Amino acid sequence: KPMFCEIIKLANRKRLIFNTTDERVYDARLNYCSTADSTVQADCHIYWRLKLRRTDAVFEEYTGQGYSLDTAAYPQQYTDIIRGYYSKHVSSSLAANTQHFVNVLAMLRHAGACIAHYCMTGKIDFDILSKKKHKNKEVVTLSNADSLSFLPHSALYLPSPLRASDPEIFNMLYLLGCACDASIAMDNISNTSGAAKYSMPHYNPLQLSHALHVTIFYMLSLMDSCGYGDDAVLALTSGLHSVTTVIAHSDEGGITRDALRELSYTQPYGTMPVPIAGYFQHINVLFTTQPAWDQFAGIWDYVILATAALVHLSDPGMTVNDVTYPTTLTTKVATVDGRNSDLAAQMMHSATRFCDIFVENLSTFWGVVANPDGNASQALLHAFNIVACAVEPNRHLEMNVMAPWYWVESSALFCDYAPFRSPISSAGYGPQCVYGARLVLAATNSLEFTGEAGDYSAYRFEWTTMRHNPLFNILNKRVGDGLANVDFRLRPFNEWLLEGQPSRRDTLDEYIWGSTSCDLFHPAELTSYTAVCVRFRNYLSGADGDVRILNTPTREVIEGNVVTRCDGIRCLDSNKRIQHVPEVARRYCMMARYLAQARTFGALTIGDDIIRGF
Amino acid sequence: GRKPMFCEIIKLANRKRLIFNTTDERVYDARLNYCSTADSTVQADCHIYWRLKLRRTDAVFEEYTGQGYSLDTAAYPQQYTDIIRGYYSKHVSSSLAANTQHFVNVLAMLRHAGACIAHYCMTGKIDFDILSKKKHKNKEVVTLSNADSLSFLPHSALYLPSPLRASDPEIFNMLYLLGCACDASIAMDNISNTSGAAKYSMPHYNPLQLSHALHVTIFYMLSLMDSCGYGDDAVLALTSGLHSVTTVIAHSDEGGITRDALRELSYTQPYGTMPVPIAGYFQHINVLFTTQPAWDQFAGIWDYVILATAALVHLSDPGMTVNDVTYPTTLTTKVATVDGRNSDLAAQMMHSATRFCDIFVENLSTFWGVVANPDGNASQALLHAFNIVACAVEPNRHLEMNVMAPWYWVESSALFCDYAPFRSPISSAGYGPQCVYGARLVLAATNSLEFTGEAGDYSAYRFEWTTMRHNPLFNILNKRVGDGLANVDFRLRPFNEWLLEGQPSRRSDTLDEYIWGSTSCDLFHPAELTSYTAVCVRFRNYLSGADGDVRILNTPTREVIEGNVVTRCDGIRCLDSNKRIQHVPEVARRYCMMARYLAQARTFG
């Protein structure tokens, strides 16, 4: 539960977002310094754009057709206490020795939605918490109902002891169940200007939001007591991302954003017992009543971003030649109306594993214990299926080659990444810098020196991925020349996958993409399954009146490790340089042909024969 | 009876519009999620629609003839006959025979009351005018005192004692209204609250508690008749009224024969004595709604019961055993249908409707909590209603057939929290419901098959083949338009013969060519595209173009065809009718080779 830490908690935001044309950015500046020479360093600013999905994104119709959880049985103590709440009424004494099931996923997702809406626009009322349908919600009352009536397994029954112990969670549960319209039933409503109209005291936005927080955690505890925690947890994050567009860094990634938005749930039910001491309530993030909007927005914006970044660390490893690359998709069939049905099929065949890994990391991110049946993975895989087969012009799929499992850069966003089960971090493609620590990592791939001609030194890189070696972003964010002195020795055989700028087609800064957000190299951008020879241009032209030297690093730095470190996280407004989208090559390339030929015929078809001419 | 099946499954879906005419219709949408236990990639979402329409704008105000079924042998049991003593004067009540008879016939009242219920569920209007068929205005009522003068009437009369009016005034008022609707002499103890007036005046109600009282009287009368043992017959009358005012438009051109049966099922004038109800007869309905519920929750519960009644017919019908393997009932006739009437098909339908009505009223009474009558009295009534449907000289849409599959009214595959109560052979055969509402059902992926081998670009399997519904994997593919159900084809068939083929236009070779339009229900008809002999199917797993590349396709792999399917239910919404829902499948219903195979089939009886 404390698995989320206080990183964006401390950044101080002040802007309230009113439209979708505006956004806030969480700038995190990073110092890249090689352990060998402390003067080859650079300042690279990751950004994290957060904007409003729509002006009225929280008011989207519930519909009610979604993943329907069942068999979420309460543990023992809750069965006893719910038996107690039932036996009070003769109309409930019937269901006395029956096992009671809860399913608040719908209210949980709407809670996440409106809490993100609050973190962005700052305003909440009962309309925003009840889809502005609270005005005429008729509550069936357990006392006024006939004796022929009987409390169904599918009625949201809010016991009176719940309002006795804490009326804030009571009113919040009522408002959310009104939003995710459900048969809410109380022990008795106080007939007052309405037979079933439930009037509640007007809250100042701050107490309202605090009640919303504490009731979100109440429901999380409730679902977690059933083992179905990631069952009522994932839904919360889906709600979160249903309102705040977390602009992705790469056009390929961020398909999981639409996957989450496509996810819905069936109408809530079950009874709401008073919280039993603290199973999950013992961890209380904020305690001051009506806490200021700034710190609240801090906690929940960091939760938004940590979830959104957990994908990059929850990515399955695509094995090529016993080497692990970040799972990247590839198809030959042309795009028709902005979709590749085969790209969607491969996205599903990867999500088959990506989703259980992602839910494992999410469970360990909220501390909710995992369960064997993995229902959450089923729900998310179904959401992916829905976003795949949708017959609509869908960006994020205009491409023939795409990297799906990377939505927002997950580096410098966690006090540590120790608990996360992510196989892409055992390979080199995980975080670049842990927050609050100095991280030493390899600055280039397995490298070998291969000659030094006039004002050039060539190195064979045993190249794997641009990100895998970070020295190049030091050279790019160097105050001097940004990689204009480093270039390739391209041959027939070294083919580029997701290469930087197709519109140009030898200096390397052309083969990068110039992501003006998240300076850090996107995993699987300059991939290649072969080695690559790369020249560093040390000197200017010889035989002239001058032979000038440059800051181009020496063979120690190129071969020696680099350390990385994060320097706080400012909150900034909408600049212009950050919106610039990179023009990455996303067309069926000869490198895609190896992947197709390995899938169709066999993996033994791309071994050592990719390299042509030693 | 104890507990009737009333899951607030349809109650949860919130209805927006009220229906005032027959041009529009309310569509209940239910999504079903299908996925293989082999791999969760091959999934699909099937949208079962149930379309409800108002039969006619004034489908309740229909001329009451008072003719037809007349139950004249429902007398109270002991407890009720003793409670009846106490409506006479003490002097008479003390010295009355202990074995007296009090014959009850409330059936016409329950039919009109069901009609009023469903009319309220469609239009949302209910009042004394509706409930009395414009008769409560000037209904003169005999005012005998102390039900000693009850034998003083020159005929049997519907008597409403004063203890009933004192116990539950709304039940008494509603019974007055109903007995006024269908011609029925009423007898009350005090004619008018103001002594001197010959007409009993109404404590005018609000429509909300008006409909609440209608509900409570339906249950009262059901309990009353059930105390006699003729409960199944009472509930049959109730559902007759229900489907007599609303039309649940079917999932097949044929289906709705049972609709026409329930239409023509009428009852004679009611009579009897209405005691104060026994306190704990119906323990509880599974749902609970408050006194004066909004039209919303009422429409919810009663639309659920309309659709559940409609579902029971498919849920229960005798599966015909061909070569001792059971199929959904399908009736074939060589004679050509004339001017919209197929006589031989009518006679066949009757012969099978015998067993159908037996099992159907058994299951209906199971669904209402009332024990089925030990003798099949009600079933015989429904069978006679069928008979009047069959030999009607008028044209009929549902019998324009030459090969029909009778008993399939609406899909019963998502409206029941449990099916174990019902006894149905079709469920045991597997053509029953596929996904219990609120339970992940693991059913067999297809028919029992064997892998006969694979060729270059295809892979064959020998289905021991019964019916498309018994092959639940193919609607997963059916939903997937991107190379899903166009890779399955029958160009490996020796003779391409199917009863109920589907798309007969393009005959006069992929599986998508031999399927129904099926736009209103993505799940498969129980007698969809059946064959009694094993058939072999080949899948187009790859695609090797003429140039040389070999594109792999999304056709399910072998362990998908041989590993089970899991099905769960999703939300049930409601919405408005669009053009795409109304699309009616053109289906092949003509005497074929398989037809004359079935005419000579085993059919062990």
- Give CA–CA dist A317/A300, Å, rounded: 30
Q: With CB atoms and an 8 Å threshold, state whether B40 touches A181.
A: no
Judge whether A391 is closer than 8 Å to chain B, CB to CB. yes
Whether residue A64 and residue B31 make contact (CB cut-off 8 A), yes or no, is no
Comparing C-alpha atoms, which of B397, B385, B427 is closest to residue B256?
Answer: B397
Which helix (H) or strand (E) segment holds residue A555: the answer is helix A555-559
Contact A204, A211 (CB under 8 A): no
User: Is residue B418 within 8 Å of residue B441, measured between CB atoms?
Assistant: no
Instruction: Tell me whether residues A68 and B290 touch, CB distance under 8 A.
Output: no
- Residues with Cβ within 8 Å of A331's Cβ and at least 6 positions away in sequence, in order, are A340, A342, A343, A346, A400, A401, A588, A592
B570 and A138 within 8 Å at the Cβ level: the answer is no
Which chain A residues touch B482 with a CB distance below 8 Å? 341, 344-345, 389
Q: Are A68 and B569 a contacting pair at CB < 8 A? A: yes
How near does any CA of chain B get to the CA of A377, in Å?
10
Residues B19/A161, Cβ–Cβ less than 8 Å: no
- Separation in Å, CA A269 to CA A107, B349, B473: 10, 44, 31
Closest chain B residue to the Cα of A377, Cα to Cα: B40
Distant-in-sequence, close-in-space partners of A607: CB < 8 Å, separation ≥ 6: A321
| Integer angstrom CA distances of residue B200 from A141, B147, B180 | 34, 17, 11
Both tokens of residue A208? 């309202």
Chain B segment 400-459 residues within 8 A of A by beta carbon are: 417, 438-440
Across the strands, what pairs with B44? B34
CA distance readout (Å), B194 to B166, B201, B230: 16, 9, 38
Please state, in angstroms and rounded to a whole number, the distance separating the CA atoms of residues A66 and A479.
52
Tokens of B167: 């116990």
Q: Are residues B567 and B34 in contact, defined by beta-carbon separation less than 8 angstroms?
A: yes
A65 with B552: Cβ contact below 8 A? no
Which residue spans within B1-107 are E strands per DSSP? 26-36, 43-54
- DSSP code, position A101: B
A366, A221 in Cβ contact below 8 A? no
The angle, 0 to 180 degrees and rounded to 10, between the axes of the packed helices A293-313 and A341-366 is 130
Q: Residue A213 CB: number of other CB atoms within 10 A?
A: 22
Q: Could you say which of B40, B43, B573 has the minimum Cβ distance to residue A63?
A: B573
d(CA B80, CA A226): 49
Neighboring chain A residues of B481 at a CB cutoff of 8 Å:
389, 391
Pairing of strands A49-52, A156-158: unpaired
Amino acid in the structure at residue B17:
R
How many Å lie between the alpha carbon of A398 and the closest alpha carbon of chain B? 17
Query: Cβ neighbours of residue B25 under 8 Å, at least 6 residues apart?
Result: B19, B51, B52, B53, B249, B577
Contact across the interface for B43 and A185, Cβ inside 8 Å: no
Closest CA to A312 of A573, A509, A524: A524
CA distance A151 to chain B (A): 6
3-class DSSP state of A362: helix
Contact in structure between B252 and B329 (CB atoms under 8 Å): no
Residues of B in Cβ contact (< 8 Å) with A601: 550
Optimal mutation site among B284, B290, B416, interface A, most CBs of chain A within 10 A? B290
Backbone angles phi, psi at A409, to 5 degrees: -55, 125
Nearest-CA distance A145 → chain B (Å): 4
CB contact under 8 A, B482 and A389: yes
CB contact under 8 A, B293 and A142: no
Sign of CA dihedral B517, B518, B520, B525: positive
How are beta strands B272-273 and B158-160 bridged, if at all?
A: parallel
Chain-chain contact of A148 with B440 (C-beta, under 8 angstroms): no
Is the separation of the CB atoms in B332 and B402 below 8 Å? yes
The DSSP annotation for B370-420 comes to PPPPSS-HHHHHHHHHHHHHHT-SS--STT--SEE-----S--SSS-S--T
In A, minimum Cα distance to B542 occurs at A600
Residue with tokens 């029953």: B432
Residues 6+ apart with CB under 8 A from A420: A310, A313, A314, A361, A364, A365
The CA distance from B548 to A54, in Å, is 48
For residue B403, what are its two tokens?
A: 């090969």
- Amino acid B21 reads N
Encoded tokens for A119: 């973190």
Q: Does A264 touch chain B (CB under 8 A)?
A: yes
Smallest CA-to-CA distance from A86 within A157, A138, A149, A155 is with A157
Nearest to B329 by CA among B444, B436, B247, B408: B408
Residue in chain A lying closest to B282 (CA)? A148
Residue B82 contacts by C-beta under 8 Å, 6 or more apart in sequence?
none
Count of CA atoms in the C-beta half-sphere (13 A) of B2: 2
* Helix/strand/coil percent split, chain B, to 5: 35, 15, 50
Cβ-defined contact of B41 to A144 (cutoff 8 Å): no
CA atoms of B515 and B524, how far apart (whole Å):
9
CB atoms within 10 A of CB B329: 23
CB contact under 8 A, A599 and B552: yes
Read off the tokens for B25: 């219709």
Check if B294 contacts A (Cβ < 8 Å). yes
Sole residue written with tokens 């490298």? A447
What does the longest C-alpha to C-alpha distance in chain B come to? Answer: 105
Rounded CA-CA distance A114/A134 in Å is: 14
CB pairs under 8 A between A and B: 131
Distance from CA of B219 to the nearest CA of A (A): 9
Residue B295 CA: distances (Å) to CA of A178, B59, B301: 18, 19, 10
Cross-chain CB nearest to A70 (options B41, B439, B552): B439
State the best of A156, A330, A385 to mutate against chain B, taking most chain B CBs within 10 Å.
Answer: A385
Residue A525 is given by DSSP the state S
Cβ atoms of A82 and A74 within 8 Å: the answer is: yes
The β-bridge relationship of strands B565-576 and B441-443 is antiparallel
Name the residue with tokens 């009534």. B381
Beta carbons within 8 Å of B196's beta carbon, 6+ residues apart: none
Sorted by sequence, the CB contacts under 8 Å of residue B54 that are 6+ apart come out as B19, B20, B21, B22, B119, B122, B123, B245, B246, B247
The whole-angstrom distance between A604's CA and the closest CA on chain B is 17
Bridge partners for A41 per DSSP: A33
Exposure class string for B271-302: b at 16+ Cβ within 10 A, else e: bbbbbbbeeebbebbbbbbbbbbbbebbbbbb
- C-beta separation of A521 from A470 below 8 A: yes
B166, amino acid identity: A
Residues paired with residue B320 on neighbouring β-strands, in sequence order: B327
Distance CA A414, CA A269 (A): 35
Strands A140-141 and A184-186, by their bridges, are: parallel
Q: What is the DSSP string of A484-514?
A: TTEEEE--SS---BS-S-GGG--BHHHHS--
Question: What secondary structure letter does DSSP report for A567?
Answer: E
Backbone φ/ψ region at A230: left (φ over 0), alpha (ψ -120 to 50), beta: alpha
What is residue B323's DSSP assignment?
Answer: T
Model resolution, angstroms: 3.6
* Residue A595 touches partner B, C-beta closer than 8 Å: no
DSSP string, B431-461: -S-SS-TTS-EEE-SSSSEEEEEE-SS-EEE
Q: What is the DSSP code (8-state) at residue A521?
A: P
Q: Which residues in chain B touch residue A64, judged by CB atoms under 8 angstroms apart?
A: 12-13, 571-573
**Surface-to-core class of residue B78, CB atoms within 10 Å of its CB (0-12 exposed, 13-18 middle, 19+ buried):** exposed
Give just the sign of the alpha carbon dihedral B300, B302, B306, B311.
Answer: positive
* A65 contacts B572? CB cut-off 8 A: yes
The alpha carbon torsion through A461, A463, A465, A468 (nearest 10 deg) reads -40
Q: Classify residue A291 by burial, with Cβ atoms within 10 Å: 0-12, 13-18, 19+.
A: middle
Single-letter code of the amino acid located at B536: C
3-class DSSP assignment, residue A592: helix
B43 touching A (Cβ < 8 Å): yes
Alpha carbon B386 to its chain's center: 15
Q: Which of residues 151-180 of A touch B (CB under 8 A)?
A: 151-155
Contact assignment for B289 to A142 by CB distance below 8 Å: no
A94 Cβ under 8 Å from any chain B Cβ: yes
Q: How far apart are CA A304 and CA A309, in angstroms?
A: 9
User: In degrees rounded to 5, what are phi and psi of residue A453?
Assistant: -85, -170
Contact residues for B492 (Cβ-Cβ < 8 A; gap 6+)? B460, B536, B537, B538
State how far the Cα of A218 lies from the Cα of A215, in Å rounded to an integer. Answer: 5
Using CA coordinates, name the residue in chain B closest to A137.
B294
Solving technique: cryo-EM
Question: Hunting for tokens 């300076």 — which residue is that?
Answer: A519
CB contact under 8 A, B296 and A138: yes
* Gap between the Cα atoms of A428 and A524, Å rounded: 11
Between β-strands B325-327 and B320-322, what pairing exists: parallel, antiparallel or unpaired?
antiparallel
**Of B360, B330, B362, whose CA–CA distance to B348 is shortest?**
B330
Amino acid symbol at B329: T
Here the tokens at position B601 are 């089939």
Query: What values do phi and psi take at A539, rounded to 5?
Result: -110, 160
Spatial CB neighbours of A333, under 8 Å, sequence gap ≥ 6? A340, A341, A342, B551
Q: Which residues fall within 8 angstroms of residue A39, CB to CB, at 6 or more apart? A: none
Among candidates A140, A150, A345 on the partner chain, residue whose Cβ is nearest the Cβ of B290: A140
Reference A110, options A211, A44, A192, A178; nearest CA is A178
Q: How many CA atoms lie within 13 A of B599 on its CB side?
A: 14
Nearest to A382 among B33, B294, B551 (CB): B33
* Cβ atoms within 10 Å of B557's Cβ, excluding its own: 16
Q: At what angle do helices B169-181 and B207-228 cross, to 10 degrees?
A: 80
Q: CA of A190, closest CA in chain B: separation in Å? A: 14
Report how far residue B500's alpha carbon sits from residue B502's, in angstroms, rounded to the nearest whole number. 6
CB B487 within 8 A of CB B478: no
Q: Looking up tokens 């700034």, which residue turns up?
A: A294
B198 interface with A at CB cutoff 8 Å: no
DSSP codes, B280-310? TSS---SS--BSS--HHHHHHHHHHHHHHHH
CB contact under 8 A, A381 and B12: no
Residues of B in contact with A352 (CB under 8 A): 39-41
Task: Round to the nearest angstrom and report the end-to-end CA distance of chain B.
Answer: 35
To the nearest whole Å, the CA of B341 is away from the closest chain A CA by 42
Residue contact B8–A183, C-beta within 8 A = yes
CA distance B120 to B126: 6
The span from the CA of A210 to the CA of B471, in Å, is 53
DSSP string, A277-343: S-SSTTS-S--SSS--HHHHHHHHHHHHHHHHHHHHHS--EEEETTEEEE--EE--SPPSSS--HHH
d(CA B169, CA B577): 41
Rounded CA separation B429/B326 (Å): 6
Distance from CA of B349 to the nearest CA of A (A): 39
Q: How far apart are the first and last CA of chain A?
A: 53
Reduced to 3 states (helix: H, G, I; strand: E, B; else coil), residue B227 is helix
The DSSP bridge partners found for residue B51 are B27, B249
Joined tokens for residue A449: 């020196």
d(CA A184, CA A106): 13
Rounded Cα gap, residues A387 and B585, in angstroms: 29
SS3 A1: coil
